[PDB]
Design a protein around this ligand. Structure first.
Ligand SMILES: [Mn+2]
Ligand SMILES: [Mn+2]
Ligand SMILES: [Mn+2]
Length: 244
């Protein structure tokens, strides 16, 4: 019963599925890997992903209906992946962009080269709104690379961290295109700086879930209890608006 808090499953709204058929197939693979709750977090990013909320909500509702054709016990929750620009503060305050399952948690992302001071300041301002940032794929940010103190300082401030399932995996013997991200993610896991693993799934070619593989790797490397914490228990608390 894994719980996936980072996903692009809504058709025709961002760089995720293009069609209902693609949404269904992505849901089915996710369920095949053992995922039983998925939080939809389609992009909200000024200058790149600006599909109106109303359309995202409309297609999301249709995706939730489609999930019933996959499994009766597949749970589809609403959410957003919020790229940080200053306008998102008023949007969150006014409840015009979604939090995760209507909890206090919002999924926040930055750019690869965003300076630490900007990351810290943005997250600080979101916290002041009464909202808890879950930081999307921490392995993406140059500012955090090999930097336990910075990560811990964001965490101690009141934030939580998320790592993509794809980057939990070992570098492949052939055709590895993302070794550096895998190396970053591995460092974060080793230093125990990861609250949640999520898929960030978009499709069934370049960006599928790797939740089952990642779950077993964490199980083997850190034990079953840590696998349950990162793939089930922490994501569940987020979904149920409980403190971690
Ligand atoms: Mn995307
Ligand atoms: Mn992202
Ligand atoms: Mn994403």
């Amino acid at each position: 019963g894994m719980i996936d808090i980072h996903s692009h499953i809504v058709f025709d709204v961002d760089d995720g599925p293009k069609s209902r058929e693609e949404s269904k197939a992505l849901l089915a693979e996710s369920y095949r890997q053992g995922v039983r709750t998925i939080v939809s977090t389609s992009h909200r990013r000024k200058g790149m992903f600006e599909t109106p909320e109303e359309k995202i909500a409309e297609n999301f509702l249709q995706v939730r209906e489609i999930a019933k054709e996959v499994a009766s016990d597949l749970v589809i929750a609403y959410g957003a992946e919020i790229y940080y620009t200053p306008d998102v503060l008023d949007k969150l305050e006014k409840k015009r962009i979604p939090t995760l399952n209507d909890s206090r948690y919002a999924l926040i992302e930055f750019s690869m080269n965003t300076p630490y001071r900007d990351i810290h300041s943005a997250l600080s301002k979101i916290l002041m709104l009464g909202i808890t940032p879950v930081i999307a794929h921490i392995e993406r940010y140059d500012a955090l690379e090999n930097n336990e103190k910075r990560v811990r300082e964001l965490i101690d401030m009141g934030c939580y961290t998320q790592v993509n399932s794809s980057h939990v995996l070992k570098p492949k013997l052939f055709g590895e295109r993302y070794k550096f991200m895998k190396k970053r993610a591995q460092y974060f896991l080793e230093q125990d700086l990861v609250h949640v693993i999520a898929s960030d799934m978009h499709n069934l070619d370049g960006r599928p879930p790797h939740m089952a593989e990642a779950y077993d790797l964490v199980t083997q490397k850190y034990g079953e209890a840590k696998a349950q914490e990162l793939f089930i228990d922490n994501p569940r608390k987020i979904v149920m608006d409980q403190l971690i």
